[PDB]
Each structure stands twice: as structure tokens, then as C-alpha cells.
Design an enzyme around this catalytic site. Structure first.
Site, PDB file in Angstrom:
ATOM      1  CB  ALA A  14       0.676 -43.554  -0.098  1.00  0.00           C
ATOM      2  CB  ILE A  18       2.478 -35.545   6.412  1.00  0.00           C
ATOM      3  CG1 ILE A  18       3.271 -34.386   7.031  1.00  0.00           C
ATOM      4  CG2 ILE A  18       1.105 -35.651   7.066  1.00  0.00           C
ATOM      5  CD1 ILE A  18       2.657 -32.999   6.773  1.00  0.00           C
ATOM      6  CE  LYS A  42       8.841 -41.129  -6.268  1.00  0.00           C
ATOM      7  NZ  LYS A  42       8.334 -39.951  -7.067  1.00  0.00           N
ATOM      8  CG  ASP A  63       0.636 -34.112 -12.750  1.00  0.00           C
ATOM      9  OD1 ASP A  63       0.340 -33.549 -11.677  1.00  0.00           O
ATOM     10  OD2 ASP A  63       1.118 -33.488 -13.721  1.00  0.00           O
ATOM     11  CE  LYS A 175      -1.283 -27.216   1.679  1.00  0.00           C
ATOM     12  NZ  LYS A 175      -1.598 -28.584   1.147  1.00  0.00           N
TER      13      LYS A 175
HETATM   14  N1  LIG Z   1       5.903 -30.604   6.064  1.00  0.00           N
HETATM   15  C1  LIG Z   1       5.237 -29.434   6.465  1.00  0.00           C
HETATM   16  O1  LIG Z   1       5.854 -28.629   7.181  1.00  0.00           O
HETATM   17  C2  LIG Z   1       3.853 -29.174   6.042  1.00  0.00           C
HETATM   18  C3  LIG Z   1       3.242 -29.920   5.065  1.00  0.00           C
HETATM   19  N2  LIG Z   1       1.932 -29.620   4.696  1.00  0.00           N
HETATM   20  C4  LIG Z   1       1.183 -30.385   3.633  1.00  0.00           C
HETATM   21  O2  LIG Z   1       1.353 -31.755   3.915  1.00  0.00           O
HETATM   22  C5  LIG Z   1       1.242 -32.504   2.669  1.00  0.00           C
HETATM   23  C6  LIG Z   1       2.506 -33.442   2.558  1.00  0.00           C
HETATM   24  O3  LIG Z   1       3.605 -32.613   2.514  1.00  0.00           O
HETATM   25  P1  LIG Z   1       5.000 -33.333   3.180  1.00  0.00           P
HETATM   26  O4  LIG Z   1       4.644 -34.703   3.598  1.00  0.00           O
HETATM   27  O5  LIG Z   1       5.407 -32.296   4.200  1.00  0.00           O
HETATM   28  O6  LIG Z   1       6.116 -33.220   1.979  1.00  0.00           O
HETATM   29  P2  LIG Z   1       6.371 -34.515   0.961  1.00  0.00           P
HETATM   30  O7  LIG Z   1       7.142 -33.846  -0.143  1.00  0.00           O
HETATM   31  O8  LIG Z   1       7.073 -35.551   1.780  1.00  0.00           O
HETATM   32  O9  LIG Z   1       5.011 -35.200   0.456  1.00  0.00           O
HETATM   33  C7  LIG Z   1       4.639 -34.556  -0.731  1.00  0.00           C
HETATM   34  C8  LIG Z   1       3.778 -35.587  -1.438  1.00  0.00           C
HETATM   35  O10 LIG Z   1       3.033 -34.993  -2.472  1.00  0.00           O
HETATM   36  C9  LIG Z   1       3.247 -35.775  -3.625  1.00  0.00           C
HETATM   37  N3  LIG Z   1       3.020 -34.912  -4.795  1.00  0.00           N
HETATM   38  C10 LIG Z   1       3.460 -33.589  -5.003  1.00  0.00           C
HETATM   39  N4  LIG Z   1       3.073 -33.090  -6.208  1.00  0.00           N
HETATM   40  C11 LIG Z   1       2.367 -34.140  -6.795  1.00  0.00           C
HETATM   41  C12 LIG Z   1       1.712 -34.253  -8.039  1.00  0.00           C
HETATM   42  N5  LIG Z   1       1.716 -33.199  -8.918  1.00  0.00           N
HETATM   43  N6  LIG Z   1       1.075 -35.396  -8.399  1.00  0.00           N
HETATM   44  C13 LIG Z   1       1.107 -36.403  -7.474  1.00  0.00           C
HETATM   45  N7  LIG Z   1       1.675 -36.450  -6.255  1.00  0.00           N
HETATM   46  C14 LIG Z   1       2.307 -35.277  -5.929  1.00  0.00           C
HETATM   47  C15 LIG Z   1       4.735 -36.268  -3.527  1.00  0.00           C
HETATM   48  O11 LIG Z   1       4.868 -37.308  -4.344  1.00  0.00           O
HETATM   49  P3  LIG Z   1       6.554 -37.921  -4.576  1.00  0.00           P
HETATM   50  O12 LIG Z   1       6.675 -38.646  -3.257  1.00  0.00           O
HETATM   51  O13 LIG Z   1       6.455 -38.794  -5.829  1.00  0.00           O
HETATM   52  O14 LIG Z   1       7.248 -36.604  -4.703  1.00  0.00           O
HETATM   53  C16 LIG Z   1       4.751 -36.634  -2.014  1.00  0.00           C
HETATM   54  O15 LIG Z   1       4.206 -37.921  -1.825  1.00  0.00           O
HETATM   55  C17 LIG Z   1       1.193 -31.426   1.548  1.00  0.00           C
HETATM   56  O16 LIG Z   1      -0.174 -31.140   1.249  1.00  0.00           O
HETATM   57  C18 LIG Z   1       1.798 -30.198   2.248  1.00  0.00           C
HETATM   58  O17 LIG Z   1       1.331 -29.003   1.726  1.00  0.00           O
HETATM   59  C19 LIG Z   1       1.218 -28.621   5.392  1.00  0.00           C
HETATM   60  C20 LIG Z   1       1.775 -27.885   6.330  1.00  0.00           C
HETATM   61  C21 LIG Z   1       3.176 -28.034   6.711  1.00  0.00           C
END
Ligand SMILES: NC(=O)C1=CN([C@@H]2O[C@H](COP(=O)(O)OP(=O)(O)OC[C@H]3O[C@@H](n4cnc5c(N)ncnc54)[C@H](OP(=O)(O)O)[C@@H]3O)[C@@H](O)[C@H]2O)C=CC1
Length: 343
Positions: A14, A18, A42, A63, A175
Site C-alpha cells: 500500500a 501505484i 510506513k 516480506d 513480472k
Molecule cells: N512504475 C512502473 O513503471 C511500473 C510498475 N509496475 C508494477 O507496479 C507495482 C508497483 O510498482 P511501483 O508502484 O511502480 O514502485 P514502488 O517501488 O513505488 O512500489 C513497490 C512496492 O512493492 C513493495 N515491495 C517490494 N518488494 C517487497 C517485498 N519483498 N515484500 C513486501 N513488499 C514489497 C514496496 O514496499 P516499500 O514501500 O516498503 O519498498 C512498495 O510498496 C509492482 O508490481 C511493479 O512491478 C508495472 C509496470 C510498470
């Protein structure tokens, strides 16, 4: 507004770029929301400083790569959750540990949340949306073939092994395999679970942050592309970045439609508005923000057109299914860069 507030939506990850926009639009429609975060810092920030709504609560999932990471969430709340938006997956190019840090958390996070639904909420969850990617439709090695064609039906052709040349191609693989895992889960559990599935598959996602964070000089990966360009010096070398673009708020809207509308059941929604190279972005930033002219690079206007580089993308089927027009690059650049400058 009365019917929506009977419904609780669970959103993994959350705190992300996105997902915050997803949650913003969910609360605008009076839905109840439970989001997962990795820490109390957070979670408190979201509930106390960002949403400030009795319709938003958080739970800690530290995680997603972990065995049964989502079991406590759905044991506690499984009776009330009718919609699951699984958005959490690592997007980071700074690791050399491609399996430990990208491929396995992507896949096991996706397998895990669906197994938890089956375990504690098999007849309660009606709809799941998985955030996939344009990366699931093409490998990096097939993105720049002007004689090819990418559509909703296209799949990334890479293997678990051969995507591990570098962190970008490996993330692209993560992905692909995670989305594959979501559909395979329904293939083996059609008669075990009630939920129907759809995926939202974005290109590079630009647009404003849902909430400005005072001391963050490094945004999420896709947003940091534009952040870098705005802060480059006039003589600095230009990054190499080329793909489709789409606005984060269009992505959020598509996730919500993907659980509300029945024609989106079983669909891979390819979310894409237009093509860009770094020159496309420099031209737009310099044009729309003349106060940056001569301060950030100009590149070489008229060069490196994305049409001469990238594999074409046909998402006309997705546009018809969604039924709304996507924001164009000028809108994206205006909203994104103005927020950076104001901060
Ligand atoms: N931005 C883009 O251009 C695109 C994004 N996506 C997909 O959109 C989704 C969000 O990405 P985006 O919002 O862009 O980038 P963000 O980095 O802003 O969001 C990533 C989220 O994933 C969480 N996260 C990552 N690894 C873990 C883990 N091991 N355990 C728990 N939580 C985890 C992060 O948590 P924390 O906040 O604590 O790091 C964060 O909330 C992802 O699935 C990404 O692949 C798809 C296509 C394009």
C-alpha cells in the site's frame, strides 16, 4: 456509495507509487480498504498523514517472498474481503542477486497471496486484480524491433535462466513468471475458489506522486526517470530510456474497473498511451517549462524518434474494454514536473 462501503478491498504494497493512487481512488468511491506495509513507520505515515480516513487501515506483511506471508492477514480479515488487488513486487535495479531479490519475491508473493485466499477466504473473495507489466508481454531483447508487434496476447519469451543478464532484464522476467503463476493458480484451482482474475499490465508509469514526501530525493524507479532529467545539468550525459508511457491515475482507474466490470474478467489489460525516448521527454519538459530551458539538457531535437526504435504496441482491444481515454504526454509531463518543481 452505500453499497461500496459494505465492501472491503485488500491492497498489497500500500505504500508504493501505484498503490497509493489506487487507494486514493478507492476511498473516493467510499470503499473500505486494508493495505499491507512492511513497517509500522510506513503504515502510520499512510493512515496518519496521507489518507486520514476511517475507511483505511493497514496490516504488516514484512516480506512477500516468505512462506505464508499473507496467512495472518486473511486469517484475521478473510471473512470481510471481497476484492484483492495484488500490487506488491520488487522494482529495483541495484541488486546482482536476481533470484533472491527479484524473481523469487515476485513469484512467491503472487503464489502466496492466492494460496492464502484459498486457505482462509475461498468463497469470500469475488475478484482479484494482479499488477503485471508490459514486461510480461515482451523481453527487453524484443522491445526494439520496429518490424514486430506487441498486443494483449504477446508473452515475454525469456526463460528463468536467460533473463538473468542484468537487473533490468531479470526484473522483466520476474513480472512474466509472477503473472504466469497467477493464471496457473486458477488453472489448478478452478473448482476450489470463487474468485475471477484480471491483470493490469502497464508500460512505464509516470505522473504525480499521490503525496509529496519532504525529504525524498530519490523517487520510485519509473518516477525517478523524470526526476533525474529535471535535475541534470546542461552539459550532463543523457540516460538511455525508451518504452511506452502511461499515467499513474489511469493505472489506478483501470485496476478498479478491472474488479467492477464483468467484461474485464479473464483479461490482460495492456495499459499504454504513447511511445517515448529520453528525447521525447526532454522536448516535452523544455517546451512546457521554459524556466528549465538552457538549465537541463536539450538533447538533439528531431533525433531518436521512438517510432524508429521500439516494437509497435497494439492495445486497441484494451482501450475498447476500458472505455476511457488515457492522458497524453503533455498532461503527464505538466502534472509530474510541476509537482517536482513546487517541492
Ligand atoms: N512504475 C512502473 O513503471 C511500473 C510498475 N509496475 C508494477 O507496479 C507495482 C508497483 O510498482 P511501483 O508502484 O511502480 O514502485 P514502488 O517501488 O513505488 O512500489 C513497490 C512496492 O512493492 C513493495 N515491495 C517490494 N518488494 C517487497 C517485498 N519483498 N515484500 C513486501 N513488499 C514489497 C514496496 O514496499 P516499500 O514501500 O516498503 O519498498 C512498495 O510498496 C509492482 O508490481 C511493479 O512491478 C508495472 C509496470 C510498470
Amino acid at each position: 456509495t452505500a453499497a461500496n462501503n459494505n465492501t472491503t478491498v485488500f491492497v498489497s504494497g500500500a505504500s508504493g507509487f501505484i498503490a497509493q493512487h489506487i487507494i486514493r481512488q478507492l476511498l473516493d468511491q467510499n470503499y473500505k480498504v486494508i493495505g499491507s506495509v512492511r513497517s509500522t513507520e510506513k503504515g502510520d505515515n499512510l493512515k496518519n498523514a496521507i489518507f486520514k480516513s476511517a475507511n483505511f487501515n493497514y496490516e504488516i506483511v514484512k516480506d512477500i517472498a516468505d512462506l505464508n506471508a499473507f496467512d495472518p492477514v486473511f486469517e484475521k480479515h478473510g471473512k470481510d474481503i471481497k476484492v484483492v488487488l495484488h500490487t506488491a513486487s520488487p522494482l529495483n535495479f541495484t541488486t546482482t542477486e536476481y533470484e533472491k531479490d527479484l524473481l523469487i519475491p515476485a513469484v512467491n508473493g503472487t503464489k502466496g497471496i492466492l494460496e492464502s485466499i484459498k486457505k482462509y477466504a475461498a468463497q469470500t473473495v469475488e475478484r482479484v486484480v494482479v499488477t503485471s507489466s508490459f514486461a510480461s508481454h515482451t523481453s527487453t531483447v524484443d522491445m526494439c524491433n520496429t518490424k514486430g508487434k506487441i498486443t494483449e496476447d504477446s508473452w515475454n519469451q525469456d526463460t528463468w535462466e536467460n533473463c538473468q543478464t542484468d537487473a533490468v532484464r531479470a526484473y522483466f522476467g520476474s513480472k512474466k513468471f509472477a503473472e504466469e503463476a497467477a493464471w496457473e493458480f486458477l488453472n489448478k484451482n478452478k473448482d476450489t475458489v470463487k474468485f475471477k482474475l484480471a491483470t493490469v499490465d502497464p508500460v512505464y508509469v509516470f505522473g504525480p506522486q499521490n503525496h509529496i514526501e519532504p525529504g525524498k530525493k530519490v523517487l520510485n524507479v519509473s518516477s525517478e526517470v523524470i526526476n533525474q532529467l529535471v535535475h541534470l545539468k546542461k552539459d550532463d550525459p543523457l540516460p538511455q530510456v525508451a518504452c511506452g508511457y502511461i499515467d499513474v491515475r489511469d493505472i489506478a482507474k483501470a485496476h478498479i474497473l478491472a474488479f467492477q466490470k464483468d467484461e474485464l474478467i479473464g483479461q490482460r489489460l495492456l495499459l499504454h498511451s504513447g511511445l517515448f525516448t529520453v528525447q521525447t521527454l526532454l522536448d516535452a519538459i523544455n517546451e512546457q517549462f521554459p524556466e528549465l530551458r538552457g538549465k537541463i539538457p536539450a538533447g538533439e531535437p528531431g533525433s531518436n524518434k521512438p517510432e524508429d526504435l521500439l516494437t509497435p504496441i497494439d492495445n486497441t482491444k484494451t482501450k475498447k474494454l476500458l472505455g476511457f481515454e488515457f492522458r497524453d504526454l503533455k498532461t503527464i509531463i505538466q502534472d509530474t514536473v510541476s509537482q517536482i518543481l513546487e517541492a
